[PDB]
PDB file of C-alpha atoms and ligand atoms in Angstrom:
ATOM      1  CA  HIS W   8     106.908-116.967 -82.480  1.00  0.00           C
ATOM      2  CA  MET W   9     108.190-113.618 -83.579  1.00  0.00           C
ATOM      3  CA  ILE W  10     105.272-111.816 -81.872  1.00  0.00           C
ATOM      4  CA  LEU W  11     104.530-112.730 -78.291  1.00  0.00           C
ATOM      5  CA  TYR W  12     101.343-111.729 -76.332  1.00  0.00           C
ATOM      6  CA  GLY W  13     101.722-110.801 -72.811  1.00  0.00           C
ATOM      7  CA  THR W  14      99.687-109.503 -70.010  1.00  0.00           C
ATOM      8  CA  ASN W  15     100.226-107.671 -66.814  1.00  0.00           C
ATOM      9  CA  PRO W  16      98.892-108.593 -63.396  1.00  0.00           C
ATOM     10  CA  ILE W  17      97.579-105.197 -62.406  1.00  0.00           C
ATOM     11  CA  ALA W  18      94.285-106.339 -64.131  1.00  0.00           C
ATOM     12  CA  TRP W  19      93.805-108.722 -61.240  1.00  0.00           C
ATOM     13  CA  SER W  20      95.665-106.968 -58.424  1.00  0.00           C
ATOM     14  CA  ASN W  21      96.599-103.378 -58.587  1.00  0.00           C
ATOM     15  CA  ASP W  22     100.136-102.499 -57.594  1.00  0.00           C
ATOM     16  CA  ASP W  23      99.738 -98.760 -56.601  1.00  0.00           C
ATOM     17  CA  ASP W  24      96.469 -99.314 -54.721  1.00  0.00           C
ATOM     18  CA  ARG W  25      96.562-102.623 -52.921  1.00  0.00           C
ATOM     19  CA  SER W  26      92.755-102.396 -52.025  1.00  0.00           C
ATOM     20  CA  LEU W  27      92.024-103.078 -55.691  1.00  0.00           C
ATOM     21  CA  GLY W  28      92.001-106.870 -56.194  1.00  0.00           C
ATOM     22  CA  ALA W  29      93.535-107.524 -52.768  1.00  0.00           C
ATOM     23  CA  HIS W  30      91.395-110.748 -52.510  1.00  0.00           C
ATOM     24  CA  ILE W  31      92.590-112.194 -55.784  1.00  0.00           C
ATOM     25  CA  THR W  32      95.425-114.562 -55.293  1.00  0.00           C
ATOM     26  CA  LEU W  33      98.525-114.984 -57.368  1.00  0.00           C
ATOM     27  CA  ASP W  34      97.195-118.460 -58.102  1.00  0.00           C
ATOM     28  CA  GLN W  35      94.027-117.143 -59.693  1.00  0.00           C
ATOM     29  CA  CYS W  36      95.794-114.457 -61.659  1.00  0.00           C
ATOM     30  CA  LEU W  37      98.233-116.916 -63.111  1.00  0.00           C
ATOM     31  CA  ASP W  38      95.635-119.591 -63.842  1.00  0.00           C
ATOM     32  CA  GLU W  39      93.388-117.263 -65.890  1.00  0.00           C
ATOM     33  CA  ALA W  40      96.346-115.679 -67.643  1.00  0.00           C
ATOM     34  CA  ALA W  41      97.404-119.160 -68.927  1.00  0.00           C
ATOM     35  CA  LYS W  42      93.868-120.169 -69.613  1.00  0.00           C
ATOM     36  CA  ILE W  43      93.153-117.146 -71.628  1.00  0.00           C
ATOM     37  CA  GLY W  44      96.152-117.913 -73.912  1.00  0.00           C
ATOM     38  CA  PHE W  45      98.760-115.458 -72.972  1.00  0.00           C
ATOM     39  CA  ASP W  46     102.355-116.412 -73.690  1.00  0.00           C
ATOM     40  CA  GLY W  47     103.806-114.660 -70.576  1.00  0.00           C
ATOM     41  CA  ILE W  48     103.099-112.151 -67.939  1.00  0.00           C
ATOM     42  CA  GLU W  49     105.002-109.128 -66.406  1.00  0.00           C
ATOM     43  CA  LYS W  50     105.812-108.658 -62.663  1.00  0.00           C
ATOM     44  CA  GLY W  51     103.282-107.782 -60.148  1.00  0.00           C
ATOM     45  CA  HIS W  52     103.569-107.164 -56.448  1.00  0.00           C
ATOM     46  CA  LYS W  53     102.401-110.632 -55.607  1.00  0.00           C
ATOM     47  CA  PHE W  54     105.152-112.337 -57.621  1.00  0.00           C
ATOM     48  CA  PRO W  55     108.020-114.052 -55.913  1.00  0.00           C
ATOM     49  CA  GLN W  56     111.331-112.155 -56.606  1.00  0.00           C
ATOM     50  CA  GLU W  57     113.638-115.212 -56.354  1.00  0.00           C
ATOM     51  CA  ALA W  58     114.381-117.235 -59.564  1.00  0.00           C
ATOM     52  CA  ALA W  59     113.414-120.731 -58.433  1.00  0.00           C
ATOM     53  CA  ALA W  60     110.260-119.606 -56.752  1.00  0.00           C
ATOM     54  CA  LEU W  61     109.250-117.394 -59.570  1.00  0.00           C
ATOM     55  CA  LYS W  62     109.936-120.442 -62.001  1.00  0.00           C
ATOM     56  CA  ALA W  63     107.930-122.704 -59.780  1.00  0.00           C
ATOM     57  CA  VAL W  64     104.766-120.740 -60.381  1.00  0.00           C
ATOM     58  CA  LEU W  65     105.180-119.596 -63.957  1.00  0.00           C
ATOM     59  CA  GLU W  66     106.361-122.870 -65.627  1.00  0.00           C
ATOM     60  CA  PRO W  67     103.379-125.066 -64.626  1.00  0.00           C
ATOM     61  CA  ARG W  68     101.237-122.548 -66.488  1.00  0.00           C
ATOM     62  CA  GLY W  69     103.389-122.190 -69.611  1.00  0.00           C
ATOM     63  CA  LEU W  70     103.936-118.576 -68.805  1.00  0.00           C
ATOM     64  CA  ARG W  71     107.227-116.724 -69.632  1.00  0.00           C
ATOM     65  CA  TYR W  72     108.256-113.843 -67.473  1.00  0.00           C
ATOM     66  CA  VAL W  73     108.023-110.897 -69.863  1.00  0.00           C
ATOM     67  CA  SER W  74     109.613-108.259 -67.580  1.00  0.00           C
ATOM     68  CA  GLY W  75     109.282-106.227 -64.499  1.00  0.00           C
ATOM     69  CA  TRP W  76     108.904-102.499 -63.653  1.00  0.00           C
ATOM     70  CA  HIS W  77     111.949-101.072 -61.980  1.00  0.00           C
ATOM     71  CA  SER W  78     111.738 -97.670 -60.411  1.00  0.00           C
ATOM     72  CA  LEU W  79     114.551 -95.047 -61.130  1.00  0.00           C
ATOM     73  CA  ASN W  80     115.701 -92.272 -58.841  1.00  0.00           C
ATOM     74  CA  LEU W  81     118.266 -90.557 -61.152  1.00  0.00           C
ATOM     75  CA  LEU W  82     117.110 -87.091 -60.062  1.00  0.00           C
ATOM     76  CA  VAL W  83     118.274 -87.545 -56.434  1.00  0.00           C
ATOM     77  CA  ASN W  84     120.704 -90.432 -56.546  1.00  0.00           C
ATOM     78  CA  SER W  85     123.897 -90.805 -58.267  1.00  0.00           C
ATOM     79  CA  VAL W  86     124.284 -93.055 -61.353  1.00  0.00           C
ATOM     80  CA  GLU W  87     126.232 -95.693 -59.423  1.00  0.00           C
ATOM     81  CA  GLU W  88     123.629 -96.007 -56.725  1.00  0.00           C
ATOM     82  CA  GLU W  89     121.044 -96.452 -59.566  1.00  0.00           C
ATOM     83  CA  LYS W  90     123.173 -99.200 -61.253  1.00  0.00           C
ATOM     84  CA  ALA W  91     123.266-100.931 -57.808  1.00  0.00           C
ATOM     85  CA  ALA W  92     119.536-100.600 -57.346  1.00  0.00           C
ATOM     86  CA  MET W  93     118.816-102.026 -60.810  1.00  0.00           C
ATOM     87  CA  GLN W  94     121.210-104.994 -60.432  1.00  0.00           C
ATOM     88  CA  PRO W  95     118.941-107.313 -58.558  1.00  0.00           C
ATOM     89  CA  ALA W  96     116.312-106.832 -61.128  1.00  0.00           C
ATOM     90  CA  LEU W  97     118.943-107.376 -63.835  1.00  0.00           C
ATOM     91  CA  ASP W  98     119.818-110.739 -62.251  1.00  0.00           C
ATOM     92  CA  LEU W  99     116.345-111.962 -61.907  1.00  0.00           C
ATOM     93  CA  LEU W 100     115.603-111.095 -65.500  1.00  0.00           C
ATOM     94  CA  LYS W 101     118.579-113.000 -66.808  1.00  0.00           C
ATOM     95  CA  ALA W 102     117.798-116.133 -64.678  1.00  0.00           C
ATOM     96  CA  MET W 103     114.336-116.049 -66.093  1.00  0.00           C
ATOM     97  CA  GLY W 104     115.309-115.589 -69.708  1.00  0.00           C
ATOM     98  CA  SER W 105     113.778-112.158 -70.108  1.00  0.00           C
ATOM     99  CA  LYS W 106     115.362-109.706 -72.551  1.00  0.00           C
ATOM    100  CA  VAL W 107     113.935-106.404 -71.339  1.00  0.00           C
ATOM    101  CA  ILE W 108     113.912-104.117 -68.104  1.00  0.00           C
ATOM    102  CA  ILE W 109     111.005-101.624 -67.745  1.00  0.00           C
ATOM    103  CA  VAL W 110     112.047 -98.335 -66.069  1.00  0.00           C
ATOM    104  CA  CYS W 111     110.416 -95.223 -65.011  1.00  0.00           C
ATOM    105  CA  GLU W 112     111.737 -92.179 -63.033  1.00  0.00           C
ATOM    106  CA  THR W 113     109.411 -92.045 -59.934  1.00  0.00           C
ATOM    107  CA  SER W 114     111.430 -90.091 -57.463  1.00  0.00           C
ATOM    108  CA  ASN W 115     109.018 -87.221 -57.811  1.00  0.00           C
ATOM    109  CA  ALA W 116     106.061 -89.097 -59.424  1.00  0.00           C
ATOM    110  CA  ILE W 117     102.469 -88.706 -58.242  1.00  0.00           C
ATOM    111  CA  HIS W 118     100.606 -91.455 -59.849  1.00  0.00           C
ATOM    112  CA  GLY W 119     100.749 -93.491 -56.663  1.00  0.00           C
ATOM    113  CA  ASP W 120      99.589 -90.560 -54.588  1.00  0.00           C
ATOM    114  CA  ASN W 121      95.803 -90.849 -54.157  1.00  0.00           C
ATOM    115  CA  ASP W 122      95.389 -87.392 -52.795  1.00  0.00           C
ATOM    116  CA  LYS W 123      97.286 -85.472 -55.609  1.00  0.00           C
ATOM    117  CA  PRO W 124      95.569 -84.343 -58.691  1.00  0.00           C
ATOM    118  CA  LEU W 125      97.158 -85.321 -62.054  1.00  0.00           C
ATOM    119  CA  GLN W 126      97.436 -81.722 -63.061  1.00  0.00           C
ATOM    120  CA  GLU W 127      99.937 -81.177 -60.241  1.00  0.00           C
ATOM    121  CA  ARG W 128     102.355 -83.842 -61.757  1.00  0.00           C
ATOM    122  CA  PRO W 129     106.026 -82.812 -61.774  1.00  0.00           C
ATOM    123  CA  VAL W 130     107.657 -81.249 -64.905  1.00  0.00           C
ATOM    124  CA  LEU W 131     111.430 -81.551 -65.370  1.00  0.00           C
ATOM    125  CA  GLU W 132     113.132 -78.144 -65.552  1.00  0.00           C
ATOM    126  CA  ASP W 133     114.372 -77.561 -69.091  1.00  0.00           C
ATOM    127  CA  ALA W 134     118.000 -77.300 -68.087  1.00  0.00           C
ATOM    128  CA  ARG W 135     117.996 -80.770 -66.378  1.00  0.00           C
ATOM    129  CA  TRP W 136     116.938 -82.861 -69.385  1.00  0.00           C
ATOM    130  CA  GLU W 137     120.528 -83.345 -70.735  1.00  0.00           C
ATOM    131  CA  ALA W 138     121.752 -84.671 -67.393  1.00  0.00           C
ATOM    132  CA  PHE W 139     118.732 -86.813 -66.884  1.00  0.00           C
ATOM    133  CA  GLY W 140     118.848 -88.368 -70.310  1.00  0.00           C
ATOM    134  CA  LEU W 141     122.577 -89.074 -69.979  1.00  0.00           C
ATOM    135  CA  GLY W 142     121.931 -90.808 -66.756  1.00  0.00           C
ATOM    136  CA  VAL W 143     119.212 -92.982 -68.375  1.00  0.00           C
ATOM    137  CA  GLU W 144     121.540 -93.859 -71.105  1.00  0.00           C
ATOM    138  CA  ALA W 145     124.124 -94.964 -68.646  1.00  0.00           C
ATOM    139  CA  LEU W 146     121.748 -97.338 -67.009  1.00  0.00           C
ATOM    140  CA  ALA W 147     120.864 -98.651 -70.405  1.00  0.00           C
ATOM    141  CA  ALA W 148     124.417 -99.198 -71.527  1.00  0.00           C
ATOM    142  CA  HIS W 149     124.943-101.058 -68.194  1.00  0.00           C
ATOM    143  CA  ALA W 150     121.997-103.226 -68.839  1.00  0.00           C
ATOM    144  CA  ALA W 151     122.887-103.901 -72.429  1.00  0.00           C
ATOM    145  CA  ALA W 152     126.326-105.114 -71.288  1.00  0.00           C
ATOM    146  CA  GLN W 153     124.298-107.859 -69.585  1.00  0.00           C
ATOM    147  CA  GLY W 154     121.868-108.938 -72.368  1.00  0.00           C
ATOM    148  CA  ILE W 155     119.045-106.725 -70.988  1.00  0.00           C
ATOM    149  CA  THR W 156     117.537-103.956 -72.934  1.00  0.00           C
ATOM    150  CA  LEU W 157     116.208-100.923 -71.020  1.00  0.00           C
ATOM    151  CA  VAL W 158     112.784 -99.674 -72.168  1.00  0.00           C
ATOM    152  CA  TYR W 159     111.675 -96.412 -70.677  1.00  0.00           C
ATOM    153  CA  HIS W 160     107.938 -96.261 -69.667  1.00  0.00           C
ATOM    154  CA  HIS W 161     106.509 -92.755 -70.256  1.00  0.00           C
ATOM    155  CA  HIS W 162     103.713 -92.588 -67.664  1.00  0.00           C
ATOM    156  CA  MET W 163     101.068 -90.158 -66.519  1.00  0.00           C
ATOM    157  CA  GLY W 164     102.156 -88.421 -63.323  1.00  0.00           C
ATOM    158  CA  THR W 165     105.826 -88.438 -64.094  1.00  0.00           C
ATOM    159  CA  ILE W 166     108.322 -86.079 -65.790  1.00  0.00           C
ATOM    160  CA  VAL W 167     107.846 -88.067 -69.060  1.00  0.00           C
ATOM    161  CA  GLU W 168     104.104 -87.779 -69.858  1.00  0.00           C
ATOM    162  CA  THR W 169     103.490 -85.557 -72.777  1.00  0.00           C
ATOM    163  CA  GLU W 170     104.425 -86.338 -76.424  1.00  0.00           C
ATOM    164  CA  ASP W 171     106.881 -83.442 -76.364  1.00  0.00           C
ATOM    165  CA  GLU W 172     108.558 -85.037 -73.300  1.00  0.00           C
ATOM    166  CA  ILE W 173     108.667 -88.439 -74.985  1.00  0.00           C
ATOM    167  CA  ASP W 174     110.509 -86.537 -77.687  1.00  0.00           C
ATOM    168  CA  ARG W 175     112.931 -84.976 -75.276  1.00  0.00           C
ATOM    169  CA  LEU W 176     113.783 -88.461 -73.616  1.00  0.00           C
ATOM    170  CA  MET W 177     114.553 -89.681 -77.213  1.00  0.00           C
ATOM    171  CA  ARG W 178     116.669 -86.700 -78.108  1.00  0.00           C
ATOM    172  CA  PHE W 179     118.747 -86.990 -74.914  1.00  0.00           C
ATOM    173  CA  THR W 180     119.294 -90.737 -74.878  1.00  0.00           C
ATOM    174  CA  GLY W 181     120.506 -93.361 -77.136  1.00  0.00           C
ATOM    175  CA  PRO W 182     121.710 -95.725 -78.615  1.00  0.00           C
ATOM    176  CA  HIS W 183     121.022 -98.344 -75.901  1.00  0.00           C
ATOM    177  CA  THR W 184     118.039 -96.539 -74.324  1.00  0.00           C
ATOM    178  CA  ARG W 185     114.801 -97.690 -75.988  1.00  0.00           C
ATOM    179  CA  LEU W 186     111.194 -96.533 -75.627  1.00  0.00           C
ATOM    180  CA  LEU W 187     108.326 -98.696 -74.204  1.00  0.00           C
ATOM    181  CA  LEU W 188     105.383 -97.329 -76.309  1.00  0.00           C
ATOM    182  CA  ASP W 189     102.333 -97.419 -73.951  1.00  0.00           C
ATOM    183  CA  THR W 190      99.480 -96.503 -76.083  1.00  0.00           C
ATOM    184  CA  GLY W 191      97.164 -95.732 -73.139  1.00  0.00           C
ATOM    185  CA  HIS W 192      99.458 -93.417 -71.298  1.00  0.00           C
ATOM    186  CA  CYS W 193     100.368 -91.753 -74.582  1.00  0.00           C
ATOM    187  CA  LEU W 194      96.774 -90.734 -75.491  1.00  0.00           C
ATOM    188  CA  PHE W 195      95.935 -90.075 -71.778  1.00  0.00           C
ATOM    189  CA  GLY W 196      98.858 -87.571 -71.921  1.00  0.00           C
ATOM    190  CA  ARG W 197      97.296 -85.860 -74.925  1.00  0.00           C
ATOM    191  CA  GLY W 198      99.946 -87.417 -77.258  1.00  0.00           C
ATOM    192  CA  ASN W 199      99.156 -89.223 -80.553  1.00  0.00           C
ATOM    193  CA  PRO W 200     100.169 -92.898 -80.203  1.00  0.00           C
ATOM    194  CA  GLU W 201     100.509 -93.387 -84.072  1.00  0.00           C
ATOM    195  CA  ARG W 202     102.601 -90.195 -84.411  1.00  0.00           C
ATOM    196  CA  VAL W 203     104.831 -91.129 -81.483  1.00  0.00           C
ATOM    197  CA  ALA W 204     105.357 -94.516 -83.261  1.00  0.00           C
ATOM    198  CA  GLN W 205     106.237 -92.896 -86.595  1.00  0.00           C
ATOM    199  CA  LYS W 206     108.917 -90.873 -85.012  1.00  0.00           C
ATOM    200  CA  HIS W 207     110.438 -93.474 -82.640  1.00  0.00           C
ATOM    201  CA  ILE W 208     109.484 -96.971 -83.872  1.00  0.00           C
ATOM    202  CA  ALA W 209     113.180 -97.872 -84.460  1.00  0.00           C
ATOM    203  CA  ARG W 210     113.832 -97.223 -80.704  1.00  0.00           C
ATOM    204  CA  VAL W 211     110.809 -98.947 -79.414  1.00  0.00           C
ATOM    205  CA  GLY W 212     111.765-102.045 -77.656  1.00  0.00           C
ATOM    206  CA  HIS W 213     108.496-103.006 -75.909  1.00  0.00           C
ATOM    207  CA  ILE W 214     104.808-102.162 -76.419  1.00  0.00           C
ATOM    208  CA  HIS W 215     101.774-101.839 -73.898  1.00  0.00           C
ATOM    209  CA  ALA W 216      98.592-102.248 -75.741  1.00  0.00           C
ATOM    210  CA  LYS W 217      96.428-100.271 -73.306  1.00  0.00           C
ATOM    211  CA  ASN W 218      93.102 -98.461 -74.082  1.00  0.00           C
ATOM    212  CA  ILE W 219      91.424 -95.571 -72.424  1.00  0.00           C
ATOM    213  CA  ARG W 220      87.723 -94.759 -72.069  1.00  0.00           C
ATOM    214  CA  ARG W 221      87.396 -91.209 -73.502  1.00  0.00           C
ATOM    215  CA  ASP W 222      84.473 -90.538 -71.262  1.00  0.00           C
ATOM    216  CA  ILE W 223      86.352 -91.277 -68.158  1.00  0.00           C
ATOM    217  CA  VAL W 224      89.661 -89.462 -69.264  1.00  0.00           C
ATOM    218  CA  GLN W 225      87.366 -86.324 -69.885  1.00  0.00           C
ATOM    219  CA  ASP W 226      86.026 -86.684 -66.267  1.00  0.00           C
ATOM    220  CA  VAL W 227      89.577 -86.913 -64.912  1.00  0.00           C
ATOM    221  CA  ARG W 228      90.685 -83.727 -66.534  1.00  0.00           C
ATOM    222  CA  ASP W 229      87.476 -81.763 -65.608  1.00  0.00           C
ATOM    223  CA  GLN W 230      87.219 -82.931 -61.996  1.00  0.00           C
ATOM    224  CA  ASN W 231      90.966 -82.742 -61.338  1.00  0.00           C
ATOM    225  CA  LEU W 232      91.126 -86.474 -60.230  1.00  0.00           C
ATOM    226  CA  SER W 233      94.225 -88.299 -59.166  1.00  0.00           C
ATOM    227  CA  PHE W 234      95.708 -91.109 -61.215  1.00  0.00           C
ATOM    228  CA  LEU W 235      94.399 -93.792 -59.009  1.00  0.00           C
ATOM    229  CA  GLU W 236      90.830 -92.125 -59.036  1.00  0.00           C
ATOM    230  CA  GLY W 237      90.861 -92.381 -62.853  1.00  0.00           C
ATOM    231  CA  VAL W 238      91.910 -95.985 -62.490  1.00  0.00           C
ATOM    232  CA  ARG W 239      89.036 -96.871 -60.218  1.00  0.00           C
ATOM    233  CA  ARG W 240      86.493 -95.030 -62.617  1.00  0.00           C
ATOM    234  CA  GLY W 241      87.801 -96.997 -65.537  1.00  0.00           C
ATOM    235  CA  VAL W 242      90.044 -94.642 -67.419  1.00  0.00           C
ATOM    236  CA  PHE W 243      91.817 -97.743 -68.781  1.00  0.00           C
ATOM    237  CA  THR W 244      90.402-100.656 -70.675  1.00  0.00           C
ATOM    238  CA  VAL W 245      91.673-103.116 -73.275  1.00  0.00           C
ATOM    239  CA  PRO W 246      91.999-103.513 -77.009  1.00  0.00           C
ATOM    240  CA  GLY W 247      88.635-103.980 -78.668  1.00  0.00           C
ATOM    241  CA  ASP W 248      86.514-102.479 -75.982  1.00  0.00           C
ATOM    242  CA  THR W 249      83.967-100.319 -77.841  1.00  0.00           C
ATOM    243  CA  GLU W 250      84.127 -97.737 -75.067  1.00  0.00           C
ATOM    244  CA  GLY W 251      87.851 -97.248 -75.739  1.00  0.00           C
ATOM    245  CA  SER W 252      89.382 -94.603 -78.000  1.00  0.00           C
ATOM    246  CA  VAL W 253      92.865 -95.824 -78.962  1.00  0.00           C
ATOM    247  CA  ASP W 254      93.255 -96.777 -82.578  1.00  0.00           C
ATOM    248  CA  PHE W 255      95.428 -99.827 -82.376  1.00  0.00           C
ATOM    249  CA  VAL W 256      96.002-100.989 -85.984  1.00  0.00           C
ATOM    250  CA  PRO W 257      97.810 -97.942 -87.306  1.00  0.00           C
ATOM    251  CA  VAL W 258     100.349 -98.224 -84.376  1.00  0.00           C
ATOM    252  CA  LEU W 259     100.656-101.897 -85.188  1.00  0.00           C
ATOM    253  CA  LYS W 260     101.055-101.182 -88.834  1.00  0.00           C
ATOM    254  CA  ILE W 261     104.064 -98.859 -88.200  1.00  0.00           C
ATOM    255  CA  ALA W 262     105.582-101.505 -86.130  1.00  0.00           C
ATOM    256  CA  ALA W 263     104.997-104.218 -88.714  1.00  0.00           C
ATOM    257  CA  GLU W 264     106.615-101.919 -91.422  1.00  0.00           C
ATOM    258  CA  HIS W 265     109.741-101.527 -89.624  1.00  0.00           C
ATOM    259  CA  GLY W 266     109.916-105.124 -88.437  1.00  0.00           C
ATOM    260  CA  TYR W 267     109.248-104.943 -84.679  1.00  0.00           C
ATOM    261  CA  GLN W 268     110.014-108.162 -82.847  1.00  0.00           C
ATOM    262  CA  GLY W 269     109.124-108.980 -79.323  1.00  0.00           C
ATOM    263  CA  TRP W 270     106.240-108.451 -76.941  1.00  0.00           C
ATOM    264  CA  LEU W 271     102.861-106.782 -77.073  1.00  0.00           C
ATOM    265  CA  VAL W 272     101.508-106.718 -73.538  1.00  0.00           C
ATOM    266  CA  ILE W 273      97.920-106.000 -72.517  1.00  0.00           C
ATOM    267  CA  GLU W 274      98.130-103.868 -69.483  1.00  0.00           C
ATOM    268  CA  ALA W 275      94.805-102.571 -68.248  1.00  0.00           C
ATOM    269  CA  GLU W 276      94.333-101.299 -64.636  1.00  0.00           C
ATOM    270  CA  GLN W 277      90.621-101.569 -63.763  1.00  0.00           C
ATOM    271  CA  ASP W 278      88.566-102.124 -60.678  1.00  0.00           C
ATOM    272  CA  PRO W 279      88.383-105.936 -61.041  1.00  0.00           C
ATOM    273  CA  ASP W 280      85.096-106.214 -59.058  1.00  0.00           C
ATOM    274  CA  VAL W 281      83.287-104.074 -61.724  1.00  0.00           C
ATOM    275  CA  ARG W 282      85.527-104.998 -64.640  1.00  0.00           C
ATOM    276  CA  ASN W 283      86.185-108.693 -64.526  1.00  0.00           C
ATOM    277  CA  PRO W 284      89.802-109.329 -65.456  1.00  0.00           C
ATOM    278  CA  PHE W 285      89.064-112.654 -67.059  1.00  0.00           C
ATOM    279  CA  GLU W 286      86.429-111.002 -69.397  1.00  0.00           C
ATOM    280  CA  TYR W 287      88.361-107.979 -70.204  1.00  0.00           C
ATOM    281  CA  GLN W 288      91.678-109.732 -70.650  1.00  0.00           C
ATOM    282  CA  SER W 289      89.998-112.417 -72.838  1.00  0.00           C
ATOM    283  CA  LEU W 290      88.533-109.527 -74.942  1.00  0.00           C
ATOM    284  CA  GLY W 291      91.880-107.879 -75.054  1.00  0.00           C
ATOM    285  CA  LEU W 292      93.921-110.838 -76.210  1.00  0.00           C
ATOM    286  CA  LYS W 293      91.163-111.792 -78.903  1.00  0.00           C
ATOM    287  CA  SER W 294      91.153-108.173 -80.183  1.00  0.00           C
ATOM    288  CA  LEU W 295      94.916-107.567 -80.079  1.00  0.00           C
ATOM    289  CA  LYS W 296      95.732-110.604 -82.119  1.00  0.00           C
ATOM    290  CA  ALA W 297      93.144-109.623 -84.657  1.00  0.00           C
ATOM    291  CA  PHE W 298      94.521-106.093 -84.867  1.00  0.00           C
ATOM    292  CA  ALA W 299      98.103-107.478 -85.167  1.00  0.00           C
ATOM    293  CA  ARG W 300      97.116-109.745 -88.062  1.00  0.00           C
ATOM    294  CA  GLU W 301      95.183-106.797 -89.700  1.00  0.00           C
ATOM    295  CA  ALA W 302      98.423-104.738 -89.328  1.00  0.00           C
ATOM    296  CA  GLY W 303     100.628-107.534 -90.869  1.00  0.00           C
ATOM    297  CA  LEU W 304     102.642-107.530 -87.603  1.00  0.00           C
ATOM    298  CA  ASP W 305     101.721-111.093 -86.812  1.00  0.00           C
ATOM    299  CA  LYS W 306     102.139-112.961 -90.032  1.00  0.00           C
TER     300      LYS W 306
HETATM  301 MN1  LIG E 401     102.301 -99.800 -69.369  1.00  0.00          MN
END
């Protein structure tokens, strides 16, 4: 298959807030992911991080290891310390057959901080962009030399949140640095997912099909809520949820027209007691494959 459909375990057990889905075992998450029809799944905090142990739980369920989030600290640590911090991840990904590493600068991020409003998120001083981009590119050239493509995950609560900042990451990196286009964080960050795709599709190496509930996002902005408070209130949902406001097909149409190959991952943080992951992830996969057909991406 030229298009593979993935999921992310934070639908089942949240990574940032371990009180969300704490009771849901790895075994349940993986059973339901396979049963729903996903081709693979991304790293979650309950995943073994050794190759044999991770293979032992994914292979019985027909699940490929899509990729894993790896946190960056380029703003406080040297490049060589950051290459040495990503290497264990690069080795696991190779042993698992994965082709992508997902990265985000978190050294000053606030999305994991429950008590910090999202409006207080860090902004990278204008003079530090050139150095920061160069450092990201150095990790991506390092990764590429090993078969792994770096995809940068712009993210609420980080220095890469707005559309303008996505454009600055793209100006100050390349050619090995790719963009992970997350439709949910892009709209949450007041950006236009379609317009971002128009500009950067040729650099997009990985796509997260995430939806937002416009009602809840407007609540987050007005009441000054943290990222994890938005998550608990349902700021995110899946493709095809009527309460959502992301327009998926135009983004998938841009991807089709330039020949995107690879994964589309449904990543939807929700409170799983209220928003059953089996239900919402079933809805997501059903709707995203429809949208991908309508877009001519999945032919
Ligand atoms: Mn994502």
